[PDB]
Design a protein around this ligand. Structure first.
Ligand SMILES: Nc1ncnc2c1ncn2[C@@H]1O[C@H](COP(=O)(O)OP(=O)(O)OP(=O)(O)O)[C@@H](O)[C@H]1O
Ligand SMILES: Nc1ncnc2c1ncn2[C@@H]1O[C@H](COP(=O)(O)OP(=O)(O)OP(=O)(O)O)[C@@H](O)[C@H]1O
Ligand SMILES: Nc1ncnc2c1ncn2[C@@H]1O[C@H](COP(=O)(O)OP(=O)(O)O)[C@@H](O)[C@H]1O
Ligand SMILES: [Mg+2]
Ligand SMILES: [Mg+2]
Lengths: 244, 241, 231, 144, 385, 392
């Protein structure tokens, strides 16, 4: 009858919340931690990849930070496989926006498109919701720097500092004390590195399992420079922060 | 694809999905709205669990559907902005088809209709949101306030509140608001809305947002430096009397 | 285990030894502790030593069926140990680990509920890790101190090897620090196994003293067995 | 069945003892054994073998004339009337299994007694048919 | 003055101890006397010690006696019992020395089957049950009428139905309508909770049911109230692991006892359940269950009758509108109406008013029916029915 | 003997125990005269001698099985062949309940007494024998829930006049459902503090036994013990344990749990018509409960517990820090009264942690730094939440 094998993914609980997104919000906590700090001069995205070993390739390997546009970059926290489709759809939507308006897509539009994609599955279709939450960073002439976050529920809010993933509460509590409104990029970077050091489950902090994405604006005006910190430059900030 | 029916008539007559969506709304942030002679005020609160949320790019709880009609919701925030998008595109289509700016009644009927259809169509759970629609019809100065339930029932309210602890705000409005004698000024409406909120929000002047709707395409959003100004004299008049 | 015993003392022995202390700071006497870590690391040794020096009878129930079998009497629920333990006070109840908790995490919360109302008894429960446990146990107000027994470091391994090596005839000038530095991954009980195997190896050559190279043979055999049985 | 968790190994002792008594070294060939199960899909394959219970007589639901014969048999003691059409009653019952007809007779008698009649009629039998049947709820003639 | 107080307190204990000692846990009552010292007369008769033992094959006369575990003696009579009074299976009061059959005894019954016999007739009556007139009429016609006036059933020459189901949603009146029968009857009303028939050792439920039915057959007219037969009611099924086959064994023993190779013998039996769906179709078959009552949610008139019955007491304000209260409470089982009455009584107490008015009843019914709606049972169990 | 008023010294007090002695001596004189008038040869204390000599020694112990033809019975000792013992006059024929422990005579084996059980080998643990500690003052806030629990469980026992005059049977049972760590257990401790009734606690885990039979056996025993020691305030706690968990030690699995729950749902309501047995269950997950249990008429008033608000948080802080060796530097106003989410358990946990930390430094006084450190310590050791993301 094709009924007994159905799990009723989009069903309201007796008290009144969904159950599949409820467990997706638990699956999020079991993934690698990510951190996002909103600084006056730029935005720093950092994440600690999980399941690290000596045989893990680090030369050309980015699994938590992804590029959607020359100005906009995102951080993935959750199941990378499900995040891949969302990343591809976001890139397609951004390129279609450039097709339609010939102007850089604002971050809010892409954030809405991805939230709608998640909500469509959380609403109908009877399919499991995406178990991934994003951290959006970008720039424009509308509101300057922007730092949103996503959820499997498909809701997004603006944040001056966020950390989705494992030990979210500890990272948030650590960052809220040290967060001011006037850091440069370097202060935010060192704060994020200290937070990652104090929230990690291992003992030391080796450059292999840390990823960095920064947004900077220098002599050139109107265009920021997006640089994904490679391991050779990654090991540099470790001595600057004093962790070494 | 998915054709299985999700809303099934219970043996006692209610629809379990709709009455579960009622509770889903009951866990949302409190949103209240009152109307004067020529002013309608939509007051709302925000979650204070987490801090470090900026104001500029944070999505406003009260979303502008058109220049003359605005909407506020409560409950699940994810699903509500979908209704907002559908209402906006339907309003544009109505402008195209009837050469007339949309009316509050027609937009509320459309929102109730789409919620009803989702309670009707198979494979889709009902919306977990409850919406408040306020605004002024073209060439008319009368404020119209409408409430739409996830069950699909819509009604006009001189003053209605939704969300958590809505019973307290309802009973407060039942005695400090007169249906036959509405407040005559925007300041009085704002003061009533604010004093209604402190009955539940119990501190949180930072995360209390209020939108004032005026006729002739006038929709404003009072900032914090004015809301705390009202709160000053409200708390001054509270304890001394 | 230098720090670990340091908090274990002040959480277990200090209330029993000085109950008057836990009145001026106005805090309820801690009901019990939770010790975790890799198996074979001293989780029962640190409990037994404190229960011994504080002079408290050390009960080690590990299952209702085993308790009824050993005491040879019928019982419907586990609180029969509680009445029998109230007569002999102070006392410590120690429940080990290795369905949902097999009852070891059940009887833990069943005991913790009764002791909230029943009072000089403490419960120490040893587990392997801290996400297989029931959230009720992790709730604040219930079991208080979460003490870590990390796998011993090279200095800790050297200390354990020295402590267990003062039981057999040892040739002069055995560099135990070198042997422990060679011993990587092995923890706690493996050190005792290494020492016993070295003692056996000295016997195999019909000798009278234990040597450093027999220690090497023993540690090699222990490592081989430990890495083989992991399969 | 094979099981390592737990099992009903006690009853199986009696089952194998019955199997060995039915066939094996001891027969005596003078002790016929009847057995009236209800779920033949559960019985062990060994117990269904030949040598053991050989004839497997199938008891079907009564035929049309069979229902009339059953109703006639079970309406002897009661004070019936002389106008009861047994054929009509037998046709009224459809896939009625045995005791479901004795229940019909009992219910018809009970209804006749309740209404004060000194002897049952065809109407009482029809009312009993409606009482016993899956119309045990009855009532509510809404929307047919 | 405390110098007086000291011996004033001392005299209390001294005098009470003196009185207790002078006047002089395991006895009867000395003030009631009745413990006469004539017991030596009923004591010198060393025939009082009588070995109990179940008799066996009657050797044509010699009797084989099977003393539980002392021996398997073969014994003659003792001249105090007629030779035809002893038959196989009977329990004999065998004499201690030079064993003899002295006194036959009632058949051994398990103690655990004894307290399941109500001798404390409950405090309910048919007037209490409302909104169930037809169902109560059917229950009467099945259980009470055959014993009360069996002459009519002889005149019509019919056998009244023996066995009746009481299916329905929970908290509708099943246990209430069995308690009313227990009060208003004159026959023994052996009660059986479904869970009680689930022992630990294999096959003990079958013995439970067999001994219960033997005890019921011992009496002239008995009513059995197998209740929550949902416990031992599992439909026969196979899963490879032999799931809960002992409960199935008990259930088939019960089915055979109800209608097997031997008639029942005036043992009218009442069942009651909240989920009749999971009952094996063999039990539902007529012969062991004839009538299937349909205790269901009451209508408006039923609700009004329930309110009148449960508000016969209470200081209700005259002029209350019971029709309006009944209407503003749709699809609520009678237990919820009783709870509404209790809460209406309570709300007046909290306001210190000694009389509960209509405004109080409206608040109570709103709170109970609407507020306590998520914790409602009549919406899931209706599907099972 | 009666009670004595007043507490302190007073001449009227002396008169009171003078009346006590006067009446006591008068009873003694009456008993002495009555005995002396009686024919000692069959009176006085010779009855004791006759009872002892007829009783014989030693009195064996067996089990009663029937009362057929009173003055006759069938005892069943563990080793004897189940004699046809006769019942003597000394024993009380009202305590000879089938299944008791009778006292057979040694040789003739005639019942000469009933040995009451008086053991309670398992109930003694259950039976509340000393009030825990906290009174209703220790509970900060929760006034409505306290009022409801009082008028449901306390007033029917202490003050039945209101209910009998009003004409309503008291609400049978109360279930305390709510968020974990919010005082659902504290309120039970409070109602156990002031009580004139036995308080037999039980936890839902203990009803998940290992053997098939002893699932309903335990519940039947618990409710029988509650009935005999009337009134009773049985406090089945963690009632959701039967539903979830699915313990391996349970031989039956789900089916045995179902039978146990059926026996519970019967014993709560019953055909037996039990008397004054109030039932108070409390659970974290009201959702996973078969609605047969929570149906009205079994537990009527379902009290809801909610996480405390800011004023309730400050009240809890005040009551819990009342017994503090607090230095003035600590400010209670901004201590934990921050509106950044707490619970009834967090406020006490941080106090306990700070007290322990102050003990570690051997500082007899509590510092604001230690309180802040324990505050953040409790904050990190906190599984935050899951459903807020839906409405975040
Ligand atoms: N028709 C009725 N007349 C009077 N009282 C009723 C009626 N229906 C229900 N009640 C009330 O509700 C209860 C009837 O249900 P009862 O307590 O006997 O349980 P039940 O229906 O047998 O439950 P379950 O099916 O769970 O075993 C009684 O307390 C009674 O006062
Ligand atoms: N309002 C309050 N006033 C005083 N103490 C409180 C209050 N609320 C909670 N507590 C404290 O919280 C501690 C732990 O909470 P408690 O054990 O009462 O919660 P519970 O929800 O009943 O438990 P559980 O979830 O473990 O079954 C108690 O020891 C009590 O002292
Ligand atoms: N640090 C240690 N010092 C001394 N002996 C140890 C140590 N760790 C383990 N042991 C040995 O191991 C045994 C205890 O093992 P334990 O760590 O309790 O294993 P488990 O915790 O898995 O039961 C003791 O007999 C002791 O001799
Ligand atoms: Mg019932
Ligand atoms: Mg609790």
């Amino acid at each position: 009858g094709s009924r007994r094998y159905d799990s009723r993914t989009t069903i309201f609980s007796p008290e009144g919340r969904l159950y599949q997104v409820e467990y997706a919000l638990e699956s999020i906590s079991h993934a690698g931690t990510a951190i996002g700090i909103m600084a006056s001069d730029g935005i720093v995205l950092a994440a600690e990849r999980k399941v690290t070993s000596t045989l893990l390739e680090q030369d050309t390997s980015t699994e938590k930070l992804y590029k959607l546009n020359d100005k906009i970059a995102v951080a993935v926290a959750g199941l990378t496989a499900d995040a891949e489709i969302l990343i591809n759809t976001a890139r397609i939507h951004a390129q279609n926006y450039l097709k339609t308006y010939n102007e850089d897509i604002p971050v809010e539009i892409l954030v809405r498109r991805l939230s709608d994609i998640k909500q469509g599955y959380t609403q109908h279709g009877g399919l499991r919701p995406f178990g991934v939450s994003f951290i959006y960073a970008g720039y424009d002439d509308r509101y300057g720097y922007q730092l949103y976050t996503s959820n499997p529920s498909g809701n997004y809010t603006g944040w001056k500092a966020i950390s989705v993933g494992a030990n979210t509460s500890a990272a948030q509590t650590l960052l809220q004390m040290d967060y001011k409104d006037d850091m440069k990029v370097d202060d935010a970077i060192e704060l994020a590195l200290k937070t990652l050091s104090k929230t990690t489950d291992s003992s030391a902090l080796t450059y292999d399992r840390l990823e960095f994405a920064t947004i900077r604006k220098g002599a050139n005006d109107g265009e920021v420079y997006q640089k994904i910190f490679k391991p050779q430059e990654i090991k540099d900030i470790l001595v600057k922060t004093g962790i070494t | 694809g998915y054709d299985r029916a999700l809303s099934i008539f219970s043996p006692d007559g209610h629809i379990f999905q709709v009455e579960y969506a009622l509770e889903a709304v009951k866990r949302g942030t409190c949103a209240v709205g009152v109307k004067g002679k020529n002013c309608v005020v939509l007051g709302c609160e925000r979650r204070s669990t987490l801090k470090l949320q900026d104001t500029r790019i944070t999505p406003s709880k009260v979303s502008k559907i058109d220049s003359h009609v605005v909407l506020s919701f409560s409950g699940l925030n994810a699903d509500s902005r979908i209704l907002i998008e559908k209402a906006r595109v339907e309003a544009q289509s109505h402008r195209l088809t009837l050469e007339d700016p949309v009316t509050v009644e027609y937009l509320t009927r459309y929102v109730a209709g789409v919620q009803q259809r989702y309670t009707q169509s198979g494979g889709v759970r009902p919306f977990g949101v409850s919406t408040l629609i306020a605004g002024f019809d073209p060439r008319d100065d009368e404020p119209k306030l409408y409430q739409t339930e996830p069950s699909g029932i819509y009604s006009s309210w001189s003053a209605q509140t939704i969300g958590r602890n809505s019973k307290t705000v309802r009973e407060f409005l039942e005695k400090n608001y007169d249906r036959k004698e509405p407040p005559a000024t925007v300041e009085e409406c704002v003061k009533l809305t604010v004093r209604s909120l402190l009955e539940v929000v119990q501190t949180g002047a930072k995360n209390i947002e209020i939108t004032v709707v005026k006729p002739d395409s006038d929709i404003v959003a009072l900032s914090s430096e004015e809301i705390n100004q009202y709160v000053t004299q409200i708390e001054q008049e509270k304890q001394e009397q | 285990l230098t720090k670990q015993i340091k908090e274990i003392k002040e959480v277990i022995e200090l209330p029993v030894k000085h109950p008057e202390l836990f009145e001026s700071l106005g805090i309820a006497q801690p009901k019990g502790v939770i010790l975790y870590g890799p198996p074979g690391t001293g989780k029962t040794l640190l409990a037994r030593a404190v229960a011994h020096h504080t002079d408290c009878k050390f009960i080690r129930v590990s299952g209702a069926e085993l308790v009824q079998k050993y005491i040879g009497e019928g019982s419907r629920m586990v609180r029969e140990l509680f009445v029998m333990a109230r007569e002999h006070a102070p006392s410590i109840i120690f429940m080990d680990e290795i369905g949902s908790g097999g009852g070891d995490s059940e009887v833990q919360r069943t005991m913790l509920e009764l002791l909230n109302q029943l009072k000089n008894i403490k419960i120490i429960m040893a587990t392997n890790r801290l996400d297989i446990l029931d959230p009720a146990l992790l709730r604040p107000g219930r079991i208080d101190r979460k003490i870590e027994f990390p796998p011993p470091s090279v200095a800790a391994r050297a200390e354990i090897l020295r402590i267990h090596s003062r039981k057999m005839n040892l040739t002069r000038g055995i560099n135990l620090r070198k042997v422990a530095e060679k011993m990587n991954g092995c923890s706690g009980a493996d050190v005792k196994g290494v020492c016993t195997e070295a003692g056996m190896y000295a016997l195999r050559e019909r000798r009278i003293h234990v040597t450093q190279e027999d220690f090497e043979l023993a540690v090699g055999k222990v490592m081989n067995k430990n890495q083989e049985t992991a399969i | 069945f094979d099981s390592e968790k737990s099992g009903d190994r006690e009853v199986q002792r009696t089952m194998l003892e019955l199997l060995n008594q039915l066939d094996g070294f001891s027969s005596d060939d003078r002790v016929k054994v009847l057995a009236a199960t209800n779920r033949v899909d559960v019985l062990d394959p060994a117990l269904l073998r030949s040598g053991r219970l050989d004839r497997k007589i199938e008891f079907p639901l009564p035929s049309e004339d069979s229902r009339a014969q059953i109703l006639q048999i079970h309406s002897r003691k009661m004070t019936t009337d002389d106008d009861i059409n047994w054929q009509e009653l037998a046709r009224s019952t459809d896939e009625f299994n045995g005791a479901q007809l004795k229940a019909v007779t009992v219910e018809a008698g009970m209804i006749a007694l309740r209404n004060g009649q000194s002897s049952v009629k065809h109407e009482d039998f029809v009312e009993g048919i409606s009482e016993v049947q899956a119309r045990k709820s009855k009532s509510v003639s809404f929307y047919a | 003055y405390a110098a007086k107080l000291k011996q004033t307190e001392n005299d209390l204990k001294d005098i009470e101890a003196r009185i207790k000692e002078k006047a002089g846990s395991d006895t009867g009552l000395a003030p009631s006397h009745l413990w006469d010292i004539m017991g030596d007369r009923q004591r010198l008769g060393e025939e009082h010690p009588l070995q109990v033992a179940r008799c066996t094959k009657i050797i044509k006369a010699k009797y084989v006696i099977n003393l539980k575990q002392i021996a398997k003696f073969v014994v003659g009579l003792g001249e105090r019992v007629s030779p035809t009074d002893i038959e196989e299976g009977m329990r004999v009061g065998v004499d201690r020395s030079k064993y003899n059959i002295e006194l036959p005894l009632p058949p051994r019954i398990d103690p655990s089957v004894t307290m399941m016999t109500v001798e404390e007739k409950p405090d309910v009556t048919y007037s209490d049950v409302g909104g169930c007139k037809d169902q109560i009429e059917k229950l009467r016609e099945v259980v009470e009428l055959p014993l009360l006036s069996p002459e009519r059933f002889a005149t019509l020459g019919i056998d009244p139905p023996k066995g009746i189901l009481l299916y329905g949603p929970p908290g509708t009146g099943k246990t209430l309508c069995a308690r009313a029968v227990a009060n208003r009857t004159d026959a023994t009303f052996i009660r059986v909770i479904g869970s009680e028939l689930v022992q630990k050792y294999v096959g003990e439920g079958a013995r439970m049911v067999r001994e219960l039915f033997e005890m019921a057959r011992t009496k002239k007219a008995c009513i059995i109230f197998f209740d929550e037969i949902d416990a031992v009611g599992g439909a026969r099924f196979d899963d490879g692991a032999g799931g809960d086959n002992e409960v199935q064994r008990t259930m088939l023993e019960l089915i055979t006892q109800l209608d097997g190779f031997d008639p029942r013998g005036n043992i009218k039996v009442m069942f009651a359940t909240n989920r009749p769906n999971t009952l094996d179709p063999a039990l539902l078959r007529p012969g062991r269950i004839d009538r299937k009552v349909e205790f269901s949610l009451p209508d408006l008139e039923g609700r009004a009758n329930i309110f009148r019955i449960h508000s016969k007491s209470m200081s209700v304000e005259r002029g209350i509108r019971w029709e309006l209260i009944s209407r503003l409470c749709p699809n609520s089982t009678g237990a919820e109406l009783r709870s509404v009455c209790t809460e209406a009584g309570m709300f007046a107490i909290r306001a210190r008013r000694k009389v509960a008015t209509e405004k109080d009843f409206l608040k109570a019914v709103d709170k109970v029916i609407s507020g306590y709606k998520k914790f409602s049972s009549t919406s899931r169990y209706m599907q099972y029915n | 003997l009666p009670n004595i008023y007043p507490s302190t010294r007073c001449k009227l007090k002396l008169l009171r125990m003078e009346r006590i002695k006067d009446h006591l001596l008068l009873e003694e004189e009456f008993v002495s005269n009555s005995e002396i008038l009686k024919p000692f040869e069959k009176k006085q204390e010779e009855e004791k001698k006759q009872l002892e000599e007829i009783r014989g020694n030693p009195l064996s112990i067996g089990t009663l099985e029937e009362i057929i033809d009173d003055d006759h019975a069938i005892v069943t000792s563990p080793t004897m062949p189940d004699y046809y013992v006769s019942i003597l006059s000394f024993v009380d024929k009202e305590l000879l309940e089938p299944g008791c422990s009778v006292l057979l005579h040694h040789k003739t084996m005639s019942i000469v007494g009933v040995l009451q059980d008086d053991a309670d080998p398992m109930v003694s643990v259950m039976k509340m024998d000393k009030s825990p500690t906290e009174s209703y003052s220790d509970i900060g806030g929760l006034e409505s829930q306290i009022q409801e629990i009082k008028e449901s469980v306390e007033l029917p026992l202490t003050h039945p006049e209101l209910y009998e005059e009003m004409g309503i049977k008291p609400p049978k049972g109360v279930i305390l459902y709510g968020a974990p760590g919010t005082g659902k257990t504290l309120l039970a401790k409070a109602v156990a503090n002031q009580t004139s009734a036995t308080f037999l606690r039980i936890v839902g885990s203990e009803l998940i036994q290992k053997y098939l039979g002893d699932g309903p056996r335990l519940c039947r025993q618990i409710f029988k013990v509650a009935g005999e020691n009337a009134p009773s305030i049985v406090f089945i706690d963690e009632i959701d344990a039967i539903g979830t968990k699915r313990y391996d030690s349970n031989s039956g699995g789900e089916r045995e749990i179902q039978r146990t729950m059926l026996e519970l749902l019967n014993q709560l309501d019953g055909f037996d018509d039990r008397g004054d047995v109030k039932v108070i269950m409390a659970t974290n997950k009201i959702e996973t409960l078969d609605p047969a249990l929570i149906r009205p008429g079994r537990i009527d008033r379902k009290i809801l517990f909610e996480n405390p608000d800011l004023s309730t948080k400050k009240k809890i802080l005040g009551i819990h820090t009342s017994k503090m060796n607090l230095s003035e530097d600590v400010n209670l106003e901004t201590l934990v009264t921050t509106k950044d989410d707490l619970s009834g358990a967090d406020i006490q946990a941080m106090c306990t942690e700070a007290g322990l930390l102050a003990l570690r430094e051997r500082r007899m006084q509590v510092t604001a730094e230690d309180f802040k450190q324990a505050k953040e310590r409790v904050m990190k050791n906190k599984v935050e939440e899951n459903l807020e993301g839906l409405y975040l």
